[PDB]
Amino acid sequence: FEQWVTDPVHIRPIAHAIWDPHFGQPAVEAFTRGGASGPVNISTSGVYQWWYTIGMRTNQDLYVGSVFLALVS
Amino acid sequence: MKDFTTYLSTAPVIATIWFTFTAGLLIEINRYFPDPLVFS
Amino acid sequence: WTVPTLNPDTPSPIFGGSTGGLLRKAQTEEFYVITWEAKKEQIFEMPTGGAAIMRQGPNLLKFGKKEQCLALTTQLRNKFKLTPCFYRVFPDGKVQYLHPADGVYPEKVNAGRVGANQNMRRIGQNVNPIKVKFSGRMMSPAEI
Amino acid sequence: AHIVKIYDTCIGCTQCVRACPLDVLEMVPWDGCKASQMASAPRTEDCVGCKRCETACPTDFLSVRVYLGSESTRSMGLSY
Amino acid sequence: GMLETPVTSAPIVATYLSNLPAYRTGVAPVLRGVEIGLAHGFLLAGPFIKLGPLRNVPETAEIAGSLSAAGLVLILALCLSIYGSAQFQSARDPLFSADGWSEFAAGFLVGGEAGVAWAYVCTQ
Amino acid sequence: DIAGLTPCSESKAYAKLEKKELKTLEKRLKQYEADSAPAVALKATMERTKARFANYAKAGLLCGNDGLPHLIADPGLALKYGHAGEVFIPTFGFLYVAGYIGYVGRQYLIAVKGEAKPTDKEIIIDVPLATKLAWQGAGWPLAAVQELQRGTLLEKEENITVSPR
Amino acid sequence: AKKVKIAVDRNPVETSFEKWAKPGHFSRTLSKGPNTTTWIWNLHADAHDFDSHTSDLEEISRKVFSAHFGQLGIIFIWLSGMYFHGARFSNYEAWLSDPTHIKPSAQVVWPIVGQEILNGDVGGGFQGIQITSGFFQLWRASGITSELQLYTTAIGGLVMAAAMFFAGWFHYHKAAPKLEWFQNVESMLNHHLGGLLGLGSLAWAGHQIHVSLPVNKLLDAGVDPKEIPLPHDLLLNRAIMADLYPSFAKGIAPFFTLNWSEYSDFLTFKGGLNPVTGGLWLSDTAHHHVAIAVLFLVAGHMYRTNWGIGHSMKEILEAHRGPFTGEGHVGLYEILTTSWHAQLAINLALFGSLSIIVAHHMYAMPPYPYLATDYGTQLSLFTHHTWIGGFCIVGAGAHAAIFMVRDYDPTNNYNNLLDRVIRHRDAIISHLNWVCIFLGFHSFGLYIHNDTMSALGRPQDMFSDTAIQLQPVFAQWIQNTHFLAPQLTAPNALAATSLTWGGDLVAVGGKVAMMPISLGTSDFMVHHIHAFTIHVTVLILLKGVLFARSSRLIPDKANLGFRFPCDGPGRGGTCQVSAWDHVFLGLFWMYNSLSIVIFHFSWKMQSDVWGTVTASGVSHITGGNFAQSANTINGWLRDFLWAQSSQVIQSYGSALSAYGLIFLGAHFVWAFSLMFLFSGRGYWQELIESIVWAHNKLKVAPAIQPRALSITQGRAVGVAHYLLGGIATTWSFFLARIISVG
Numbered sequence A: 001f002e003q004w005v006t007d008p009v010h011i012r013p014i015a016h017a018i019w020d021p022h023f024g025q026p027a028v029e030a031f032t033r034g035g036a037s038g039p040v041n042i043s044t045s046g047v048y049q050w051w052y053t054i055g056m057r058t059n060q061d062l063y064v065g066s067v068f069l070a071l072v073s
Numbered sequence B: 001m002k003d004f005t006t007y008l009s010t011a012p013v014i015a016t017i018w019f020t021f022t023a024g025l026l027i028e029i030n031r032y033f034p035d036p037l038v039f040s
Numbered sequence C: 001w002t003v004p005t006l007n008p009d010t011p012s013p014i015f016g017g018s019t020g021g022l023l024r025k026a027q028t029e030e031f032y033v034i035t036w037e038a039k040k041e042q043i044f045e046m047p048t049g050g051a052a053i054m055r056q057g058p059n060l061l062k063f064g065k066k067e068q069c070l071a072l073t074t075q076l077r078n079k080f081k082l083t084p085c086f087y088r089v090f091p092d093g094k095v096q097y098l099h100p101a102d103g104v105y106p107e108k109v110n111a112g113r114v115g116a117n118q119n120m121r122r123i124g125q126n127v128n129p130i131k132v133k134f135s136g137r138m139m140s141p142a143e144i
Numbered sequence D: 001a002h003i004v005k006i007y008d009t010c011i012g013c014t015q016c017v018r019a020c021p022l023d024v025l026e027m028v029p030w031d032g033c034k035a036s037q038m039a040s041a042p043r044t045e046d047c048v049g050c051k052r053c054e055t056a057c058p059t060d061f062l063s064v065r066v067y068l069g070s071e072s073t074r075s076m077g078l079s080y
Numbered sequence E: 001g002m003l004e005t006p007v008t009s010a011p012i013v014a015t016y017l018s019n020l021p022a023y024r025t026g027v028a029p030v031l032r033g034v035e036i037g038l039a040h041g042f043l044l045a046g047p048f049i050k051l052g053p054l055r056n057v058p059e060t061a062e063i064a065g066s067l068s069a070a071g072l073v074l075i076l077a078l079c080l081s082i083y084g085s086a087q088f089q090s091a092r093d094p095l096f097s098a099d100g101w102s103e104f105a106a107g108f109l110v111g112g113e114a115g116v117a118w119a120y121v122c123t124q
Numbered sequence F: 001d002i003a004g005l006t007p008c009s010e011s012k013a014y015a016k017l018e019k020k021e022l023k024t025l026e027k028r029l030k031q032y033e034a035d036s037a038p039a040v041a042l043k044a045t046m047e048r049t050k051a052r053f054a055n056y057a058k059a060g061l062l063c064g065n066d067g068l069p070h071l072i073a074d075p076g077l078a079l080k081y082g083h084a085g086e087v088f089i090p091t092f093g094f095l096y097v098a099g100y101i102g103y104v105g106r107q108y109l110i111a112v113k114g115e116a117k118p119t120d121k122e123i124i125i126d127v128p129l130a131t132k133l134a135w136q137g138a139g140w141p142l143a144a145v146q147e148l149q150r151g152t153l154l155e156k157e158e159n160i161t162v163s164p165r
Numbered sequence G: 001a002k003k004v005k006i007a008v009d010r011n012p013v014e015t016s017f018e019k020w021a022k023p024g025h026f027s028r029t030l031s032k033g034p035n036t037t038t039w040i041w042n043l044h045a046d047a048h049d050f051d052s053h054t055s056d057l058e059e060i061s062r063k064v065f066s067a068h069f070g071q072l073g074i075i076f077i078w079l080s081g082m083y084f085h086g087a088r089f090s091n092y093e094a095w096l097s098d099p100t101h102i103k104p105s106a107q108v109v110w111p112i113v114g115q116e117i118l119n120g121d122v123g124g125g126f127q128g129i130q131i132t133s134g135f136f137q138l139w140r141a142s143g144i145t146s147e148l149q150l151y152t153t154a155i156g157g158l159v160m161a162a163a164m165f166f167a168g169w170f171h172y173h174k175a176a177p178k179l180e181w182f183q184n185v186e187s188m189l190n191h192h193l194g195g196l197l198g199l200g201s202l203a204w205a206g207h208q209i210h211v212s213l214p215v216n217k218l219l220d221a222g223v224d225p226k227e228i229p230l231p232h233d234l235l236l237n238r239a240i241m242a243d244l245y246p247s248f249a250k251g252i253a254p255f256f257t258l259n260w261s262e263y264s265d266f267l268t269f270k271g272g273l274n275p276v277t278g279g280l281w282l283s284d285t286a287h288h289h290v291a292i293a294v295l296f297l298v299a300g301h302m303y304r305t306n307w308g309i310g311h312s313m314k315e316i317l318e319a320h321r322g323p324f325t326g327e328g329h330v331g332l333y334e335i336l337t338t339s340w341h342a343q344l345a346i347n348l349a350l351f352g353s354l355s356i357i358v359a360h361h362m363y364a365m366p367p368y369p370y371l372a373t374d375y376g377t378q379l380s381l382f383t384h385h386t387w388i389g390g391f392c393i394v395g396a397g398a399h400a401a402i403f404m405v406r407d408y409d410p411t412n413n414y415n416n417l418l419d420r421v422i423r424h425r426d427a428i429i430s431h432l433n434w435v436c437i438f439l440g441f442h443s444f445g446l447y448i449h450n451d452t453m454s455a456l457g458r459p460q461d462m463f464s465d466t467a468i469q470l471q472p473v474f475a476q477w478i479q480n481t482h483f484l485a486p487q488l489t490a491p492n493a494l495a496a497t498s499l500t501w502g503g504d505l506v507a508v509g510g511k512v513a514m515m516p517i518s519l520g521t522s523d524f525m526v527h528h529i530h531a532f533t534i535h536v537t538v539l540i541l542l543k544g545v546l547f548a549r550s551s552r553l554i555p556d557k558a559n560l561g562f563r564f565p566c567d568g569p570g571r572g573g574t575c576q577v578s579a580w581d582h583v584f585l586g587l588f589w590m591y592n593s594l595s596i597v598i599f600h601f602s603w604k605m606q607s608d609v610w611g612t613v614t615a616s617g618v619s620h621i622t623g624g625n626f627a628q629s630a631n632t633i634n635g636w637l638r639d640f641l642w643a644q645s646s647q648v649i650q651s652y653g654s655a656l657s658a659y660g661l662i663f664l665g666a667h668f669v670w671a672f673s674l675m676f677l678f679s680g681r682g683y684w685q686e687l688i689e690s691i692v693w694a695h696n697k698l699k700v701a702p703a704i705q706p707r708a709l710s711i712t713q714g715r716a717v718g719v720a721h722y723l724l725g726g727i728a729t730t731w732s733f734f735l736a737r738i739i740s741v742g
């Protein structure tokens, strides 16, 4: 998110990381993208654009929101 | 002959003649007036 | 007419056997026994598959469910004009008799029977489902 | 166990009793019809729900009705 | 009665089955569990080692395959245990009882893992 | 023109489309003889193609950017700009025939309901009666309206069976 | 000892149109006329169910015999049309001169509504639809060289069609054979073995020896067709025949003096394919039909009719009695002489299996000239005769179950082979059930294993030739054994029967006619798919036959009949228990299994056999991608269905544009069928009630009460549309593809 907010036009958002022991090495390399540490999925739900529009700018902004909603749950 | 003409009056026989006639009329019209798209 | 008593030693038809017979249910829950008298030796069709020869005189068969016994009863009555009767037998040794319940086949009206599950109304006079709601269980308007 | 009900439009034709493949129904005396007999359902615990009785009833609408209910070894028609 | 057949009713076949651990009555359920567990556990290692994902590694293939065979024996032991819990909640053989089956499942785990370990020692 | 369309007679894409179709036909032509059977058939096709493109332009149709005729369905726009022959006039052409067929069939169905065995008059058609009703259907719109005003077109609500409610 | 003799009845029935005007006359139920629309469907459904109209076997047999004359008369009209259209609307004469460059065509369309574009450029200064029926190759092999010869056959075909319809009328209304006549099975086999097959083979050998061989010998030499001697000149002038085949100079003396080696020049045993035409040697084909003629004529003298010598079929059956099977084949003779359905069940089974064997042998041993290099004809013929065989086999199950319900009588069957089979049906179905589950996992699971390993980037873990291998070692051994047969086991054969076993390819006109076919891991996997889908189809159909009369669910299923929808929602639900429904389900699985068979054939041929020969070597249509790609489901989707459907979807605007339209239309009919399969008539009867109300409101309600289709007719309408749509989709896809590239 913090990298995407800088250049949203030319960066694919990341949904979450992948830890699949069944993967082979070509699969691990194939899904590594976006400057991530390892394999990741690209987000398609638009939460990046939504959260960026409503004023979120850093990962700590998302962390505080996550703990707040877990408490509300 | 009365029974034979009764057989020709059965639904499948009538439909075959009727649609054969109906199709022939439409086919012939398009043979002499090819490509009708607008009444004009 | 009195309730017949089953005779476990009654001879059985001449049948080789099949894979369509009794299962473990007969040893744990129940099974059914059908008996009848045969005027002459004849070939009939087993509801479990195959053909069997009925001995002259008493015959006895064991089946896994009631419908199988009453399927053979229909064949014996309609074609061979016999009068079979069958029981329900439990693993504990108890024997329950049925069909004919009172000795007369149900198709024929008999005095002494008490009507059961008879509604003195038409189907169109049942109440609406809303009026039998929250009655403790799923209940149709026909039940009340 | 299924539920089987006989309604007062029965004409006592006996066709439901003959059709039943499990001897669930029987005929009893009655005074509400010309035949002076009515169908009865004393042994519904053996009913399997085939609805052969409803197929055989001449009256309109039916005079015998089967409402499928709780299942069991007998009503599910199992031999195992 | 049931359709007689040599496979269903033969002398040679009957004697062979009567000597198997499952049908050999008079033996404590735990001991039968160990005897059955050892046989299956020993075989269970074969396919994992030869056709596993790490089969082509020289030395890791033996370890990885056997370690996966040990895991499957553990899962099977759980299946045996819960089966006894569901089946026996309230007869001739002690095995078919709540007490007997629980001992049987425990023996299978001990025998099965021993068989998997014994199979590994054979390789190295 | 209408909705940004242009007359096909003035459309560049429309003209180019005709050349493409004629070019395809000409390419196949040059592999035959001058007056062989295949050549004559191909020439006949080309004549119909040229006639078709002249007729549509002469009809004053509208072509889009695709260079294909588009039809106008609004009665106001059609009568305003002389496109009544595309959809508006054919609308009343079809309804006359559709009502003709339906009215003739309804007359026959009523006619045989009075017979002793109506069912046998439906699988086995009474051809003399059907031809009689076929010709009298030309005036169905007049007959149809008069039935409506006299109240004999529709059944009474009390004579129609309905399910419990 | 009832003598074998002709027995008929005079004027059994009167020829009148009275009953033509009374629909339903044949059945007591339908004779009263319609009250609901259900009557109309019942009229057509039961029209040919003779066994249910009357209980008299003699009356049933007479209808069957004449209904067969009507079928023969229809085939002659159809055959006559094919020969006539070859004479008047085809480019056959041009094709004879340049067979390798001119596409066969025998259908021409009229110039209306712009459909004349379907008259494509096929060659020979002719425009028409290209045909894949292979009639041009058949006519050339027989020696036809002019449209006059085609025209005369068509006229003869119509005369035969008229004779067939006269025979049907004569043998039903004038002189109808009695029941005792129909039951001479020994006599019928004698005439049909030595008379129909035997003399038919000998007569055709006469045509080949005297017409086909001389004409095709000159055609292959390059002689202009118009300059070849006419077939009657070859017959009348032994001098001409001697020039082509010197053996004719000796007449028929060698035949009667047993110097049969004199005829070695036209009665050959070469084997292989003719290099010039790419088809089997006609001299080999003539010796085949001469050998087959003698074998069948001997076969026709086996059964005893009127003169003591011979076999009694009843005695043979009763003598074959073993320790494991109780009474044995006792009672089968009475079953097979009193049940038409039992006879039909056997004949459909083997006739269908034969049609499938024809498909395999004709492609591997192309019997006609220029058949092999015409890839459209090879693909069409193989696919056509596989579908015919598939439907016939499913019918064999249908009519085996009809026999079990109607014609089966326990009194005649006690402890015989038939009875004992019924008495362990649970053992049979339970074992066949497990085999199908085993075959499904270990064949289709391998494809799922490969698809997952490939998607995970683990190609080394796949089942393939470059990975874990599954070689058809048994099939490969047989291919090599047949390749070396001429050396030691068939010394007098010059070449192997087929070029599929091995050796060198034969190329005609720059295209491969046949070459060795290699079996690898993909072939191993696909073959075990065939075994899986065939075994499942047996399970469904065999289950229906064995449980037609009763089961543990419906103990009295026979009384319900052969074709009923259910026995109600009781016992949990009994939908589709009747034996008719096992045919209904079996049709889907037969369609599923044969679809893979014709996809296997189509991809394997294009990838590994068909192609263009050039200086460097053979380039195949799909470039040998079967071996590496057909081991995953994704490979079939991408490389076969998606790539090869390019031709059909680009067909618009060309002569093949018709196949594009039918490709879409077939997709439509298939999806339309799911409406009938996924729904039930309860919804539709209520829908019609509201529709009927609108008609009642307008005094336009019909006298024949509308009814939703029955439960069974919904299933029949569903499967018929499902099959038509699915099969037509492949049909369009195959022809538009192979015609475009092949």
Ligand code: CLA
Pocket (backbone or CB within 6 Å): F074, F075, F076, F077, F080
């Ligand atoms: C199916 C519905 C429908 C719709 C959405 C339209 C839409 C249109 N019609 Mg059409 N029209 C229809 C059915 C319809 N019409 C029918 C059934 C008839 C009778 C056979 C007509 C007769 C008709 C005429 C005579 C005219 C239009 C016109 C129009 C346009 C503007 C006025 C209008 O109708 O506003 C929206 C539509 C409605 C609310 C439905 C009723 C419309 C009535 C019948 C016509 C109104 C005309 C209007 C008073 C003209 C004022 C001058 C205008 C330049 C502003 C518009 C494109 C006018 C036009 O050509 O404008 C360029 C015009 O002169 N229509």
Ligand code: CLA
Pocket (backbone or CB within 6 Å): G013, G014, G015, G016, G017, G019, G020, G026, G062, G063, G064, G066, G067, G069, G070, G165, G166, G167, G168, G169, G172, G173
């Ligand atoms: C003109 C001559 C003639 C006449 C008047 C009759 C009259 C009669 N026949 Mg006879 N019959 C004839 C010729 C004739 N037959 C011939 C040529 C044959 C040999 C096939 C037979 C074989 C025959 C049999 C086996 C039986 C009769 C029976 C009958 C009776 C009823 C027939 C009926 O309802 O037909 C009406 C039926 C039709 C009009 C259907 C015609 C079917 C033909 C074969 C055409 C098939 C076309 C095919 C489906 C095309 C494909 C369709 C696709 C394109 C959609 C009646 C006494 C029946 C009887 O006596 O029952 C008690 C009976 O069982 N006939």
Ligand code: CLA
Pocket (backbone or CB within 6 Å): G202, G203, G205, G206, G207, G209, G210, G234, G235, G236, G237, G238, G241, G247, G248, G250, G251, G252, G255, G263, G290
């Ligand atoms: C059924 C198949 C068949 C038929 C019909 C023929 C027919 C023929 N073959 Mg062939 N042939 C066949 C199979 C057949 N062959 C096979 C399988 C082989 C391989 C072994 C051969 C090998 C072969 C050779 C090597 C030769 C022939 C030849 C012939 C011709 C003369 C035979 C001869 O001398 O007959 C002798 C006599 C008879 C057959 C008897 C004729 C009886 C007549 C028809 C009786 C008429 C009676 C009547 C009342 C009179 C009319 C009265 C009326 C006008 C009023 C003849 C056209 C010869 C030939 O000429 O080839 C070009 C020849 O050399 N064939």
Ligand code: CLA
Pocket (backbone or CB within 6 Å): G044, G045, G046, G047, G048, G049, G050, G348, G391, G392, G393, G394, G395, G396, G398, G399, G402, G563, G580, G583, G720
């Ligand atoms: C030699 C072949 C043969 C023969 C002689 C018979 C004969 C018979 N079969 Mg059998 N059958 C066969 C093959 C054969 N079958 C095959 C191959 C199958 C597998 C599909 C079956 C499956 C089968 C079933 C499931 C049943 C029969 C039944 C019957 C009996 C009544 C048939 C009837 O009334 O049809 C009347 C004919 C029709 C209603 C016409 C059917 C039209 C089809 C569905 C059209 C399909 C599309 C078309 C071919 C192409 C497109 C058309 C175009 C217009 C779009 C009769 C004894 C029935 C019976 O009761 O037997 C005791 C029965 O239930 N057969």
Ligand code: CLA
Pocket (backbone or CB within 6 Å): G433, G434, G436, G437, G438, G439, G440, G441, G444, G445, G448, G536, G539, G540, G585, G588, G589
């Ligand atoms: C793609 C669709 C599909 C599939 C997968 C199946 C599957 C099956 N059908 Mg069915 N069927 C279908 C469509 C399908 N059918 C349709 C459309 C119809 C209507 C005409 C029918 C009608 C029908 C009938 C009438 C019969 C079958 C039968 C069968 C079975 C064949 C034998 C077997 O067990 O194979 C093995 C099973 C498979 C190949 C299924 C897929 C297995 C995967 C690839 C591997 C296992 C997964 C693995 C354990 C991982 C799971 C992880 C997860 C738990 C987290 C099987 C369960 C026959 C049967 O029951 O035979 C015993 C049978 O009689 N089918």
Ligand SMILES: CC1=C(C/C=C(\C)CCC[C@H](C)CCC[C@H](C)CCCC(C)C)C(=O)c2ccccc2C1=O
Pocket (backbone or CB within 6 Å): B015, G675, G676, G677, G679, G680, G681, G684, G707, G708, G709, G710, G711, G713, G714, G715
């Ligand atoms: C659609 C559908 C129907 C409704 C379909 C019906 C009633 C068949 C309709 C057939 C035709 C279209 C109606 C009869 C047409 C007449 C012969 C008149 C035609 C006159 C000219 C136009 C030719 C069922 O009855 C049904 C039953 C069981 C399972 C599924 C279904 C199902 O899916």
